[PDB]
Design a protein around this nucleic acid. Structure first.
Lengths: 320, 103, 23, 36, 9
RNA sequence: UUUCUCUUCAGAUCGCAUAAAUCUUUCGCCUUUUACUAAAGAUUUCCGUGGAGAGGAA
RNA sequence: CUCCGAACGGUAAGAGCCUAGCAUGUAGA
């Protein structure tokens, strides 16, 4: 009856490997370095914890943000960190420099996240009041900022591909305009909910998407709800697809509905376990990302830790 | 200062009430839940087992999370004030009483 | 991804023009 | 140190009050109207 | 946190 | 053969010496600030300089 | 034993009378 019901993708099950409990507070951003040698693990204690990617050992700390930094990324062509938050301090932490020289500027209010382009010499920062600053690399200024948000921008993204926009304000108003034009050629006045899960699915185009209620698929060209997923009522706080087309969306309420690649509905329907220090109903999946080798999933819950959900050997996963 | 942190916490509480299980748009509640959360935080400041009853599960969870965030910010401000306590660095007159009360 | 390169070149030219105008 | 600023504010308020008192019943306001 | 703080203050 | 135009690449003590500013740390001060003192790191600005098209006088 | 510093934190506020170095270059009928 349901889509992909008589075609169960015989993928392996997840398996927790270890939890690196070294942060002090709810983890804000978690990302693995491109070289498979660093693991940028942010925390609300005003200290970016850049640990090891696969080992998870304490590599080094990095302060500079006065408050919780809800934005952290690492560039490819620009070997330097990229932080962003309410502190308005971008930690340009190079692997050899180990300092803060970015000096993110342009947002006249708080910041909830940012994203640097992989190829184009541009970026994006989710300002608080109404701004969407396209922080140009080696410019520290939003010369061409696609400002189409009336509240705190949920997320931001831009690259050499041609969806041309990824963003959305907190006042139920998004700007799916052309990044080259700058003007609001296409106002994405939809998704009034807290849309904070837009992970790349299979192909660059006609991929999957998410939402905090009834998550479904999307499309890079013009958008389309093709892969009709199940009723993902869980508030998907983020999503980082696997290396082999699979998709996983971390939930803000702890119930991370794990959907298959093309199935859409929750295949595992996993949840966030109650940590020993955490309360009964207080936790929530803040980040979830597969490693560079896609061997262990780095899932950072609200217990100030990062779990390594490795894969197990089993084909007994056939369900109608 | 800490006023900006308190304002950010209040805005986060409003955003959670709007998005974190708002019970659908059916003429929802108002800042009275914020008053309940503030009263619950004041009660916890007494180190008592009191809480914020009279609300659903995720509302209480978000209230506890925001209270923990505000308490962490307060403890951090207190640690920063105690750091500039031995030397002091010519502390003002009003900050001394606040740091003393926090400690 | 030739169109990607074209879009990137257009973005670079626009950024350079904006820098020359402001700076 | 702030007592100097407080005294300056008090003196400015008193000067404004005195100016208003001298101008309201001024020769151009009161005595000028006394002839009308 | 609280232990070292109350010990050195 | 000699010069002036200019988009362009510099890790050569780019300049057999030597200016400032901004930011982040550490001292001396400190009545508030701007002017400050003497050490480290980084980013820029100015006097400039090197090597390669095209276009203009003897 | 020759190394030498400057500004702000500064001059109460007031009603009657009086004097002046400066500035446009045009549209149009």
């Amino acid at each position: 009856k349901a889509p992909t019901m008589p075609k169960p993708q015989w993928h392996p099950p997840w398996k927790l490997y270890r939890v690196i409990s070294g942060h002090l507070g709810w983890v804000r951003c978690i990302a693995v370095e491109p070289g498979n040698q660093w693991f940028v693990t942010g925390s609300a204690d005003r200290t970016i914890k850049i640990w090891d990617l696969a080992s998870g050992k304490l590599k080094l700390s990095l302060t500079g943000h006065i408050s919780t930094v809800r934005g952290v990324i690492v560039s490819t062509r620009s070997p330097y960190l990229f932080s962003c938050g309410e502190d308005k301090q971008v930690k340009c932490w190079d692997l050899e420099y180990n300092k803060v020289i970015r000096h993110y500027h342009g947002h006249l209010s708080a910041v909830y996240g940012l994203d640097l382009h992989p190829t184009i010499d541009v970026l994006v920062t989710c300002s608080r009041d109404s701004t969407a600053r396209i922080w140009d690399v080696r410019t520290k200024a939003s010369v061409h900022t696609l400002s189409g948000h009336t509240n705190a921008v949920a997320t931001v993204r831009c690259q050499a591909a041609e969806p041309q926009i990824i963003t959305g304000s907190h006042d139920t108003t998004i700007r799916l305009w052309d990044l080259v034009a700058g003007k609001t050629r296409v106002t994405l006045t939809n998704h009034k909910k807290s849309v904070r899960a837009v992970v790349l699915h299979p192909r660059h185009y006609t991929f999957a998407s998410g939402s905090p209620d009834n998550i479904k698929q999307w499309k890079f060209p013009d958008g389309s709800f093709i892969q009709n997923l199940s009723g993902h009522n869980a508030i998907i706080n983020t999503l980082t697809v696997n290396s082999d087309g699979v998709l996983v969306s971390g939930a803000d309420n702890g119930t991370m509905h794990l959907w298959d690649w093309r199935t859409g509905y929750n295949f595992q329907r996993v949840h966030a376990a109650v940590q020993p220090g955490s309360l009964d109903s207080e936790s929530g999946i803040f980040a979830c990302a597969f490693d560079q080798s896609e061997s262990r999933l780095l899932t950072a819950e609200a217990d100030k830790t990062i779990k390594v959900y490795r894969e197990d050997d089993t084909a007994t996963e056939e369900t109608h | 200062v800490e006023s900006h942190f308190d304002l950010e916490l209040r805005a986060a509480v409003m955003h959670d009430i709007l998005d974190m299980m708002p019970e659908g748009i059916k003429q929802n509640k108002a800042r009275t839940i914020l008053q309940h959360l503030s009263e619950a935080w004041r009660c916890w400041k007494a180190n008592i087992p009191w809480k914020v009853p009279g609300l659903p599960t995720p509302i209480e969870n978000m209230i506890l999370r925001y209270v923990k965030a505000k308490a962490d910010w307060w403890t951090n401000t207190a640690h920063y004030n105690r750091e500039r306590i031995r030397r002091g660095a010519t502390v003002d007159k009003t900050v001394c009483k606040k740091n003393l009360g926090r400690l | 991804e030739e169109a990607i390169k074209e879009i990137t070149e257009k973005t670079r030219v626009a950024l350079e023009k904006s820098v020359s105008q402001k700076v | 140190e702030a007592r100097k600023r407080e005294l300056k504010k008090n003196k400015k308020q008193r000067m404004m009050v005195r100016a208003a008192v001298l101008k309201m019943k001024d020769p151009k306001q009161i005595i000028r109207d006394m002839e009308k | 946190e609280f232990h070292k703080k109350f010990m050195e203050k």
